[PDB]
Amino acid sequence: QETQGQAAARAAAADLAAGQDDEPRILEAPAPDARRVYVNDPAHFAAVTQQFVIDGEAGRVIGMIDGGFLPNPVVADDGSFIAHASTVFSRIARGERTDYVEVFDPVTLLPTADIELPDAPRFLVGTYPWMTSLTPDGKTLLFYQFSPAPAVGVVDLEGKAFKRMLDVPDCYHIFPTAPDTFFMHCRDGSLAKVAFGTEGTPEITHTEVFHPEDEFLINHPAYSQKAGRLVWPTYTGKIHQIDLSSGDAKFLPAVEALTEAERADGWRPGGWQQVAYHRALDRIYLLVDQRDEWRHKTASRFVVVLDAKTGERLAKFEMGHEIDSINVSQDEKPLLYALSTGDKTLYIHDAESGEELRSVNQLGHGPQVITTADMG
Amino acid sequence: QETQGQAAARAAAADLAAGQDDEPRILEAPAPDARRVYVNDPAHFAAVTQQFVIDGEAGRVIGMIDGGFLPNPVVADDGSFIAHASTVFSRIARGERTDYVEVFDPVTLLPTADIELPDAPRFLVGTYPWMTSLTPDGKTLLFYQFSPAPAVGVVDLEGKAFKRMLDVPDCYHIFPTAPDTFFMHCRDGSLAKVAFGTEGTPEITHTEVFHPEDEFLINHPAYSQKAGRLVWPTYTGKIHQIDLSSGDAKFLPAVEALTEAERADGWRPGGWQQVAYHRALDRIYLLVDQRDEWRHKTASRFVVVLDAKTGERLAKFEMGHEIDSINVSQDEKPLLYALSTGDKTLYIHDAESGEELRSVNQLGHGPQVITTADMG
Amino acid sequence: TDPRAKWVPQDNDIQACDYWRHCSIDGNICDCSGGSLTNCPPGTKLATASWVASCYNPTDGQSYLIAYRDCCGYNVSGRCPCLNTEGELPVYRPEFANDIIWCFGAEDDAMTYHCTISPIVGKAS
Amino acid sequence: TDPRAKWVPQDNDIQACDYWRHCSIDGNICDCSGGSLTNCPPGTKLATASWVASCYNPTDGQSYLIAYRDCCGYNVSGRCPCLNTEGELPVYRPEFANDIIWCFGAEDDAMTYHCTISPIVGKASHHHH
Amino acid sequence: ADDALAALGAQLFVDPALSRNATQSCATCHDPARAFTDPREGKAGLAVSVGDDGQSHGDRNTPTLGYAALVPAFHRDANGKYKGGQFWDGRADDLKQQAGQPMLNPVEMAMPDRAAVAARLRDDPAYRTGFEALFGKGVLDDPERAFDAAAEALAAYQATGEFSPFDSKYDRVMRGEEKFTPLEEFGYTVFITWNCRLCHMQRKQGVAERETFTNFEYHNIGLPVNETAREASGLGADHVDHGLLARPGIEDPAQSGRFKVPSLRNVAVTGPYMHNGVFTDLRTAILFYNKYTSRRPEAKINPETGAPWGEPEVARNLSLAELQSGLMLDDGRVDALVAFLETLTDRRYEPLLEESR
Amino acid sequence: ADDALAALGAQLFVDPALSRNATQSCATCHDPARAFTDPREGKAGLAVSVGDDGQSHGDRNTPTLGYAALVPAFHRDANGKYKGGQFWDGRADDLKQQAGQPMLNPVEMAMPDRAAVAARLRDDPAYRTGFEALFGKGVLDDPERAFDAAAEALAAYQATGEFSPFDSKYDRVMRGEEKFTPLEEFGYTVFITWNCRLCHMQRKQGVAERETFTNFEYHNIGLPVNETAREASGLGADHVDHGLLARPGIEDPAQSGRFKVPSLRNVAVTGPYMHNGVFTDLRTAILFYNKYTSRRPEAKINPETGAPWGEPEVARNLSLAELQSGLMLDDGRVDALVAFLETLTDRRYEPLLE
Ligand code: HEC
Ligand code: HEC
Ligand code: HEC
Ligand code: HEC
């Protein structure tokens, strides 16, 4: 309960009193760990943006990374690096566009790679985490393209170069499963499997249609690459779970996040990153609230936690703030991260009790995206 | 009464009722006029910034211009072009620095000139309107360099090229008097006259020292290029007026903004653009409040108005808001613009009576500088 | 005010996020940065793509198709931000999805988002 | 929270704008963006140039010269913005002036402003302040 | 009177006595069973029509007369855009100016002159009776008045509800009588959110009372020459169909290559497509537009030939701003557009859909 | 004890009997009336000193011994920067290890060996008594013990209040006993905000208790050879003075050309400057730092020669991070610095300032 600024004032006072020297220098961030959490601020479409690197245990900003227009951040699960695909222009928001990927050292935060993307091929959209995606081995970044058509761009992080664009069907999002394979969700209600070589026509297979045309799958499904779990809520809180760990899609049984009385009384998911999945606990978290059916991008004040296997409700937390996005640390005794775009504040909760533990405020202009690494 | 959004809703209602078609297109800003006001948002040192073009009469944003890091806006007094000196980097706030001048058409707001400034020569500082300056004929742009030593850059806007750097003595700010001449303010408390031919060392001449080492002259003096009036408040509200209308500096009676008593009760100037000068009315405006001597950059809630000729206080306005920056339209019956960094709001006041007429909020992040053309 | 309440359209202020034509707008109303209900501000570039919605007009009891179009080539205005989602569908029905920067076809390859216009293109069926 | 009042230094919280050493600080406190009181955050480049101030230390009644140094080459942090102006002089006395981006000397010619540190460089003696 | 003038028009419209050799009436080329287009096979398939001589071919495809009464008369609007008029190059001001043209065109009905036309009208007791009741006694004896009066009767007849019944599925759906299929509804949504609607909707914004799927503007969409039609027409290998620049009094080189946006009503049944009848299938007309947007090699290939679309007949003044939309139509979206475009078929032609579907 | 030892060192320090021809003592070169430097004009002016033999010139400028006792013993700190020691190249560890070297150096005092030093000490009955009281009976009969004890007395003598008085105007101001002049305080402000403080201050931050205006590090500031001095040294026009790299056991090439940050104390009166006495004026010394920051034509030119400074004797390992500060010292600031540096004069040498 001594704040961090108070501890600091105390120690600097003791250093002055004792004649202690120290060399003013550039700090290193502490080693990445399970409770580092990254919050990205798309800044409501501003041309430049920020990512905050946060120690979630201390509630402390340990670093920042600047980005351009609607960058897609990724974070290597093993903690070796972070990267983003980003877009800049020669004259702020006009002139020559350069898309590029930067890779950063997660301790010095220095860029160790800056890889131009030819022909400005990024999909500029409100930030969806799964629109830019690391393969499991960390060597390849895949980025979605929409214009002129759905396409996926392959970037070699190891050799630091753009590789090629892949032609795909009318599909969206990129859930990588292997060094050379990803899934996409298609307009027709199937998933598409894309398997791609250095050159050649991608191998593209579709699953069966797994949802009717009137059931709407949200833009921010939770995907645990290490568990190959794709947790995909619909607008009503019905949750589609797809198991991709065998390398092909297995459709798991559907669970309702909300009860029928809740649904009858207007309860629905809503926010940006509406859903989190804790791998080790096999638990789903969903931001829900009482709301009309078309207010599905508004903040929510409640998180339901449910067992991913049974659909049993384990908790319903009153977050006590307007929360747009959640995620969880992937360690035991996980933290539940609850970001309020309105408050520009990451609230950090104990995921078990739902209690708010601390918070980090002043995170830019419109922060929306929480990313944690799955380190363990 | 009816707001701008309201009247716009009824015109749209009426066009739909009447079945009136209209082509979606790019609007032209209304021709520059006296009541056009420019608000620059240095965004508290953000790497990118915005300038808001505002119709002071209707209190309407009529356009915007993006800028880079701490750009210096300039606005030709005749309404024919605006320009800024701005600073970009190849990777948001990092990498290769480009300083450049852009010249803008004031109705399409399109860039008409983009003039690179060799050797990243711009002075990076919280925005001082007189750190970059148009010559009276609009043909030349003069900007300050502080590093490695005070110097002035000459940019030919007509031929659209940078010319050379003038090496100067230990002096600051740039007040052009002629196509080849401008004054600066020197550490030793003189003004310096810098006349620059096409080639060679400019001819530098110092005036008398006109203030003691312990009298402090604010960073934002008002300067009316068409009057040649350099208006310089000190920290205590003492105002130096220098006439530059003859080619050489003649020193006017120095004048007090606040009363010897009033200063006894801790009235001081304070804010950013603390001073405004209305050329036709020969009249000074000074943001003031009750403050400690070392709170000289805080917002003031009051404006004093005084004759540049006598020092007679003409009015004192209780602004109604926390104001950092003032300026005035240079038409007859001028608006007094009262920009609040904190509120992000341009309050538009009647300059004779001080009542708030209207206001334009949402002016970026930390708007600071108000510019107006003097078109009459 | 209640963000979660059913959105109630009005036909009397175009700069307010409940104006009827903004029922599935995402961004900033161009009227607040020098454009108008259906025109882009000086210096920006008007996209030709758009996402659509069926918006009820409480003036006439009719539902109208509003095909939003972005004004591009400038940093986001920062004025009159709004986000409504009536009828808004996920990105895989892009014709109805509004997180996408619909800046395609804008002159000069402009793709940065400045604000959105709300012209009517049809009656809804 | 009365902005015009005389500044009241405290020696108890460095993230607050009234921390004694921040007596002429302009921008953001580096300790809020992953620096510390006298170190820059990761990725930034510490300038060699400074603007100095004599800052009264409430705790020992001594005045200390604080030579503010800027951490450069990032966009402004946005956290714990602060602007104090104790003894701050106009730009023609650059040595005491805090509107300047004091990023000179920063590695990689970095000149964009991220945050400012507040190290003590001596005991005071100023005549203006 | 408005009834009678049109009734007279009905009779002229189907009367082959208005052609030199008496083989051809307006209805021969503008066949009411075919949404007023030419079902007849010529040396260039259905691309261009054969005149009364039995050998002469035109250089342009015969357009429908359906909904042609909705086109405004030709004018330049304030944008400096030309709009409206008749013929693909807008060289007629309105229906009445257009009507006398097939009559005297030695490539079409080929009467030598007005006098020959009037002499045909006098041969018919019913015409002497019908014209004289509308235009006065001895009308048929003044070749100028006779020819003008027939053109007016013909223009009036094309303005009747028979030519623009507005009874397409689309119309019935807009009235709430029925609904679109899902494919039609996607088609419609594509149509109004993609570049199609920049040219094929009456209005820029708002709602049209009698939508005919054209803004009546002139655009060069960069079509290649139709080689067999151009061979049949005989105009030469060096000939350039300049579009609107050919209208007399249009001089502005920027109009070269621009053609009037056609109404898409009955487009399903009035193939082949474009001003030179170059594309046979509706889908090919739609795919053409991907040549401006798609990065795929197939986007450059006419699927009907397997060869490149071909260099534009007029390489300049292309509507690149509308055409280069940055978005390619996938096949799902092309299918949806065909289905939507088929809802624009008039009631009486819905059975013609069967074969094309 | 500590007094008696320093008193013995006081005798030895002025004793020419510790030189071969008995013509020279430590005080000949470290003249107390000249803040312990060499007033004597030789072949290369005051740039270098002349040994006992009347002809051998050194290749370095004789530094002041004032405040030498505040320098830490030579060491590599945890950031890898070498610090402290004695001589311009840090080649002696401390004052003790340094004291014997001039005695036995043939270009200086030129005693052949310790035994001849001990013999000289035996010749003076006052030394027999003084040494024996402190180091025991027969100390002078053993040349090793005698020389080491002479070295210890000298070191002790140099650690006295008389070498490091802290009575400069700067010291009096810091005690709040007096005030700096407007110029002197400007110089002080400039000194601590400009690059100078990055090297010429004891600590990185905080307040030093006994400031001697040097952080005791080694830096190559890129100085040219002292042409005449080098000619007078006889070391040859082929020679390279590698500064720190010359201390035995320093092998790291990054140190070639680096020299100890001298204390600026008394700097106003110990001209000429730098390790080779290459600059006669203090103003010049300060100006030399503008070659790195200033783009102006006259930054390139040594104002004492009117010619270019000269290429660095050692063109690598320059401290560019620190020297390329991006800001030029204008005349006003160079004046302010001189004024400030003059306040680092000990009270007793305040008369020397003209
Ligand atoms: C075949 C030889 C034809 C006969 C007989 C008639 N028409 Fe025709 N029509 C024909 C062609 C090849 C064209 C296009 C020619 C061009 O230069 O563009 C036309 C065009 C019309 C139009 C204009 C329709 C439009 O622009 O959309 C109209 C109104 C028209 N035709 C009517 C018309 C009438 C009234 C006829 C008998 C008097 C007639 N046509 C005969 C082909 C032929
Ligand atoms: C303006 C630049 C246009 C855009 C965008 C689209 N169309 Fe178009 N269309 C245009 C013109 C000028 C023409 C006539 C071209 C010529 O010289 O012949 C057309 C033609 C068609 C047709 C054929 C109709 C007929 O021959 O009777 C079809 C079926 C058509 N257009 C459809 C279409 C669709 C589906 C579009 C969006 C993908 C589209 N057009 C865009 C002008 C323009
Ligand atoms: C001239 C012939 C000299 C005599 C006699 C003595 N010293 Fe000296 N001293 C001299 C020079 C040229 C140098 C620099 C040598 C180099 O290689 O850098 C020195 C240095 C010292 C030092 C080091 C001071 C420092 O590094 O800051 C000390 C402590 C020193 N000298 C002491 C000293 C004593 C004790 C002497 C009598 C035995 C003595 N010096 C004689 C020049 C000459
Ligand atoms: C480390 C990079 C330094 C910086 C920055 C400054 N000085 Fe320095 N100084 C330094 C060294 C290593 C030396 C000796 C260089 C050599 O090889 O001889 C010096 C020397 C001086 C002197 C001469 C002192 C004497 O000879 O006794 C003066 C007057 C001096 N330096 C002053 C000075 C000033 C005013 C600075 C800021 C302009 C400055 N130095 C920077 C180490 C460094």
Ligand SMILES: [Ca+2]
């Ligand atoms: Ca046709």
Ligand SMILES: [Ca+2]
């Ligand atoms: Ca010396």
Ligand code: NA
């Ligand atoms: Na053909």
Ligand code: NA
């Ligand atoms: Na013509």
